[model samples]
Target: MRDVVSFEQPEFSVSRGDQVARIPVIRRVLDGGKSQVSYRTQDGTAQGNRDYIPVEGELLFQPGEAWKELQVKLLELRQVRRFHVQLSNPKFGAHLGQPHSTTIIIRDP
Candidate 1:
């Protein structure tokens, strides 16, 4: 209902040596006017800057653009790790959706 901005899924996983995690963000009501959403990463079991690079940024969605992918650099470590990324402050007739916060796991292999 209405215009919503959220992740394509609630969870994501990446291998330790992958060096990057691409997270998907989506917008519903695709025909809407320009919209923007800000995001920030929080520490979970994983520590920022060590397990994965922190991200504190905003994403913009234009008309007909339903998808935006975010990239976070992942560091190699011997153990499994995880972090939380969340969306907030949707602007221009935009709303936030369920599972606003997504978890990204970095697996050691």
Candidate 2:
């Protein structure tokens, strides 16, 4: 399967009855290719840890999304190198700050 390059941001707030924990970074690849995602977290603190957290999921891409006509104008420019996603925790609501980042990688040739 071809890979899709995309980044996901952590939800601003957690829902009381939300059970779905997995975050999906859906990339609508106008062009097909192999992909890898490297990510890091930003907490805006001198002592904050910026680690590339490991995510457990498969890479996926959409073929039917609106396509970009020009290569330079392609969506790849928006591709980030690292980002954050929700991991489904009961204590997520207790978290004080909203962490964010970007994720970007080669999606294909």
Candidate 3:
């Protein structure tokens, strides 16, 4: 990969009632036959498994595919909450990119 893998957005906001939010991870280059990477979610103001469901897994990119999406499920709440998501452990000659982490703000609906 020419550049490191990164989160498409530095931050994003979502409503608790939305139930789910999608975060996109991307690499600038798409020359590899296949690329893989792992990612995990960390709680900030939000508690994992309580305010929101925690997610951690590996993402695979097909040839010419530069991005993949990670999804988090939000729990119903009366107040707003926040969390951090990060991408790491890249494989197939990939590396972490700038702004590798992102903040997710879950708003009260």
Give the winner by lDDT. Answer: 1
- Which residue segments of model 2 deviate by more than 4 Å? 1-4, 8-12, 15-20, 42-109
TM-score of 1: 0.92
* Best prediction by TM-score: 1
Which candidate, 2 or 3, would have the higher TM-score against the true structure? 3
Candidate 2 lDDT, tens digit per residue, 9-35?
433222212321233344333343333
Q: Worst lDDT window (10 residues) for model 2?
A: 67-76
Candidate structures ordered by TM-score, highest first: 1, 3, 2
- Model 2 TM-score, all chains together: 0.28
| Worst 10 contiguous positions by lDDT, candidate 3 | 28-37
- Candidate 3 matches the true fold with a TM-score of 0.90
lDDT of 3: 0.83
Candidate order by lDDT, decreasing, is 1, 3, 2
> How many collisions per candidate?
0, 9, 0
- Could you give candidate 1's per-residue lDDT for residues 21-83 as a string of tens digits? 999988887645888889999999988978988989988887778878899888875577789
In model 1, the runs with Cα more than 4 Å from the true position are none
RMSD of 2: 17.3
